[PDB]
Design an enzyme around this catalytic site. Structure first.
Site: not given
Ligand SMILES: *[C@@H]1O[C@H](CO)[C@@H](O)[C@H](O)[C@H]1NC(C)=O
Ligand SMILES: *[C@@H]1O[C@H](CO)[C@@H](O)[C@H](O)[C@H]1NC(C)=O
Ligand SMILES: *[C@@H]1O[C@H](CO)[C@@H](O)[C@H](O)[C@H]1NC(C)=O
Ligand SMILES: *[C@@H]1O[C@H](CO)[C@@H](O)[C@H](O)[C@H]1NC(C)=O
Ligand SMILES: *[C@@H]1O[C@H](CO)[C@@H](O)[C@H](O)[C@H]1NC(C)=O
Ligand SMILES: *[C@@H]1O[C@H](CO)[C@@H](O)[C@H](O)[C@H]1NC(C)=O
Ligand SMILES: *[C@@H]1O[C@H](CO)[C@@H](O)[C@H](O)[C@H]1NC(C)=O
Lengths: 596, 201
Positions: A151, A255, A357, A384, A487
């Site tokens: 970071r 995450r 997928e 998704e 992202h």
């Protein structure tokens, strides 16, 4: 004659010319991805430039047809999609600066290499050098070093760049009649013109807060349990009353919490549902994996894969001489060409990924009848979510027993369901406060609620308040801690994961109720049910032609995103966590009690 | 009697190149022997839909003239080659009458008519002021006027070029792959009927 007929002829030439230019661009991207060679890079860049220039010229030509003289909803939807300026409304100097900033952020994130001071002879990149350390280490100072050093380098490089990025994106969005860039991102869920099914950009934030308020007790109990287990793992660092240290969550950013399943397992003595060894014993090829996935989709009533899918997909790693991207990606190239690019191994993860997928491929195949500019999901969440429901259904022990991969005399007791639900909670429930806090912080940054000198002071305050995660040491404004994630640094919307997570369980309850499953929601399998596949395919065939609210009415019977199916999914685990948290304290304190 | 002088079905079906759907080729077949069981018993045809007559009695009946119309369309556009249908091909390219007697034969030609770079030799009309009448051919390349403003021959705003190309590539789906279509039109007119089937001994 009339404006509407003129727009329909224009969107009859556009669809045909764009399908051809798209297919060519997508095929060039495919040839780059399966064959990393410099001529393929040049061909990809040429096709992409032609596609982008064509979209610019058609956007320039589409605006000359006024919206208010068109009454047909589909024509108005395609014209609304086409008439967006994007970055074209901004000046050429500022547009070039924005493009340069985006490219340099992409290079900084992709080629960012950090290693220990005084030992610089070799260094580790993020994937897989830092990912493996974050996911597997049990050492406090090593994880602290990796987290703070990455970071430090990435944030100190990206902070002026992000300060320029927010101003330029706000300038473009206000030039595009939006309040801010956050409103531009929230405009994907905007539905206008349909009576009763209208959805506003301002309603999205309220709905997200309303759903998160119901998420909060389950997340508090999960947070308390993970805090107790991490206190067992690390004796003195974690406080009973405080937040979790940031570098101990199992991933680089927090995450997902799926890498803490080993430390936080309820019943280690009980076996797992790993079926990898069973496929190794039966010699399951990747072709067999995709055939089993196809069997699952024909069982529910959806169409089977085309011959061109089997001929043109790359389902195995090509070799040393030919380089390819290892990330699994489903490609809808256009003109009925559907492919999957996955380096499939004999693992459970690859099998579930194959189901996910192929769910993406089924969603792409369903709206092939729609016009070209309406060939997408109704919102960014559905695309998704329809893959994640296949991932949910395929992972069930009933599906594994049905296909023979699990022994038929395997005992399904409550303890294995509790630990499986805890693993699914660490993957699914744990990402929700992080996603909500990150998107709310980005919305407040774009809106101007937070001044540039107070970005981090608010951010950690948000993280303590929402995620219940405390910083190891205080950070000043020279750091750019959010932009270390893929992202946010590369200009991607992040609320799609939150909406995907809620839509996933809403779709799961709707299909399981359709399939007449009579047990727990997590024990439900949607195979062999034609009616569930029909209910899914009714929404799947629409694509972007209809509002996402109407599509959600078509599946679940509700006009809005709902949080009750998720809480119903984790209800056994919720009762178990409430029982296990009697001695411990649910909830956290925002003070600096663990470490600062 | 002894039968020879067969009809030229080799120069229609086994032709090296086919015409586009807009400039569809029409070959008038007269004064020969037409063996239709050779066509019907072939396994190479995906569509052999006969309208107004059945394939079994084709080999017995006799016709004045046989019109063999040949063109290339997409896989999803084969359904529009029928009486009473609608779509771009029927409205603007090739229109069949409702009272049609004949057969529509279509087969996949991805092997010949698709190249890896894209075969843009095959074209279709996407725009016309009015729908086509049955068995009409429009080969005009005049700029389509969608607006009140005159086109003046330049493809500017609201003025499009009528003929668009099918970029046939081998890796396409089965509904987008090239299909060669031969439509046989059988009429009996007051003139002596000369296209007869083979007569048994
Ligand atoms: C990949 O690119 C190399 C570059 O020369 C070429 O030789 C090879 O045939 C390509 N393979 C595939 C599968 O496209
Ligand atoms: C809108 O246009 C499509 C074709 O572009 C047409 O099929 C549809 O019926 C139209 N809808 C209405 C309500 O006019
Ligand atoms: C796009 O930009 C042009 C000029 O910059 C403007 O006239 C037009 O209204 C814009 N379109 C939208 C949807 O804002
Ligand atoms: C898909 O199913 C149909 C009918 O069940 C079958 O004819 C076809 O061969 C299948 N496709 C493939 C690629 O197996
Ligand atoms: C599982 O079921 C058994 C038998 O009913 C019971 O004794 C045990 O307490 C249960 N455990 C949990 C975690 O529900
Ligand atoms: C679904 O159908 C297949 C086809 O016969 C069958 O083998 C399988 O057992 C069925 N699944 C279940 C759960 O009954
Ligand atoms: C056309 O080509 C096929 C393939 O060899 C052949 O069998 C057939 O006799 C030829 N002629 C006709 C009229 O179909």
């Amino acid at each position: 004659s009339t404006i509407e007929e003129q727009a329909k002829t224009f969107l009859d030439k556009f669809n045909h010319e764009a399908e051809d230019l798209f297919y060519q661009s997508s095929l060039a991207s495919w040839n780059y991805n399966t064959n990393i060679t410099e001529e393929n890079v040049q061909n990809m860049n040429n096709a992409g430039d032609k596609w982008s220039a064509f979209l610019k010229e058609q956007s320039t030509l589409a605006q000359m047809y006024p919206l208010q003289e068109i009454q047909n909803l589909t024509v108005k939807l395609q014209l609304q999609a086409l008439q967006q300026n994007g970055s074209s409304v901004l000046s050429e100097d500022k547009s070039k600066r924005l493009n340069t900033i985006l490219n340099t952020m992409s290079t900084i994130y992709s080629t960012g290499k950090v290693c220990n001071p005084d030992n610089p002879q070799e260094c580790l990149l993020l994937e897989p050098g830092l990912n493996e350390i974050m996911a597997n280490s049990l050492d406090y100072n090593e994880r602290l070093w990796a987290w703070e050093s990455w970071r430090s380098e990435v944030g100190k490089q990206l902070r002026p760049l992000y300060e320029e990025y927010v101003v330029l994106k706000n300038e473009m969005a206000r030039a595009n009649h939006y309040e801010d860039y956050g409103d531009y991102w929230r405009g994907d869920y905007e539905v206008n013109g349909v009576d009763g099914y209208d959805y506003s950009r301002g309603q999205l934030i309220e709905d997200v807060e309303h759903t998160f308020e119901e998420i909060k007790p389950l997340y508090e109990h999960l947070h308390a349990y993970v805090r107790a287990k991490l206190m067992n793992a690390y004796p003195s660092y974690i406080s009973p009353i405080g937040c979790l240290p940031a570098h101990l969550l199992g991933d680089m950013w927090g995450r997902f919490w799926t890498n803490l399943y080993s430390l936080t397992v309820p019943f280690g003595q009980k076996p797992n549902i790993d079926v990898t060894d069973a496929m190794v014993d039966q010699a399951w090829d990747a072709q067999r994996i995709f055939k089993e996935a196809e069997k699952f989709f024909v069982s529910v009533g959806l169409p089977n894969m085309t011959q061109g899918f089997w001929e043109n997909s790359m389902l195995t790693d090509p070799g040393n001489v030919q380089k390819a991207v290892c990330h699994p990606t489903a490609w809808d190239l256009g003109k009925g060409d559907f492919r999957i690019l996955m380096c499939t191994k004999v693992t459970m993860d690859d099998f579930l990924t194959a189901h996910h997928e192929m769910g993406h491929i089924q969603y792409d195949m369903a709206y092939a009848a729609q016009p070209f500019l309406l060939r997408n999901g109704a919102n960014e969440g559905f695309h998704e979510a329809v893959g994640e429901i296949m991932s949910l259904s395929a992972a069930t022990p009933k599906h594994l027993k049905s296909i023979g991969l699990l022994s038929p005399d395997f005992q399904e007791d409550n303890e294995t369901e509790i630990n499986f639900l805890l693993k699914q909670a660490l993957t699914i429930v744990g990402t929700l406060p992080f996603t909500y806090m990150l998107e709310k912080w980005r919305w407040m940054v774009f809106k101007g609620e937070i001044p540039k000198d107070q970005w981090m002071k608010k951010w950690w305050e948000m993280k303590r308040e929402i995620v219940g995660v405390v910083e190891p040491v205080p950070h000043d404004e020279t750091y750019c801690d959010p932009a270390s994630l893929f992202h946010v640094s590369n200009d991607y919307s992040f609320i799609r994961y939150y909406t995907r997570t809620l839509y996933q369980f809403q779709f799961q309850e709707a299909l399981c109720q359709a399939a007449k499953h009579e047990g727990p929601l997590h024990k439900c399998d949607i195979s062999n049910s034609t009616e569930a596949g029909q209910k899914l395919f009714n929404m799947l065939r629409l694509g972007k032609s209809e509002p996402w609210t109407l599509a959600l009415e078509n599946v679940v019977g509700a006009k809005n995103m709902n949080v009750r199916p998720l809480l119903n999914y984790f209800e056994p685990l919720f009762t178990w966590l409430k029982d296990q948290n009697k001695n411990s304290f649910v909830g956290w304190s925002t003070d600096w009690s663990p470490y600062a | 009697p002894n039968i020879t002088n067969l009809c030229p079905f080799g120069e229609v079906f086994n032709a090296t190149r086919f015409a586009s759907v807009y400039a569809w080729n029409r070959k008038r077949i007269s004064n020969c022997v037409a063996d239709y069981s050779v066509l019907y018993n072939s396994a190479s045809f995906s569509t052999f839909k006969c309208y107004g007559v059945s394939p079994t009695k084709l080999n017995d009946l006799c016709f004045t003239n046989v019109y063999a119309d040949s063109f290339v369309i997409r896989g999803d556009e084969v359904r529009q080659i029928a009486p009473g249908q609608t779509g771009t091909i029927a409205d603007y390219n090739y229109k069949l009458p409702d009272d049609f007697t004949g057969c529509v034969i279509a087969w996949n030609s991805n092997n010949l008519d698709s190249k890896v770079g894209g075969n843009y030799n095959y074209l279709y009309r996407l725009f016309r002021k009015s729908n086509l009448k049955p068995f009409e051919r429009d080969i005009s390349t005049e700029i389509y006027q969608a607006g009140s403003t005159p086109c003046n021959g330049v493809k500017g705003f609201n003025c499009y070029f009528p003929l668009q190309s099918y970029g046939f590539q081998p890796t396409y789906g089965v509904g987008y792959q090239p299909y060669r279509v031969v439509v046989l039109s059988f009429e009996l007119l007051h003139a002596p009927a000369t296209v007869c089937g083979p007569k048994k001994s």
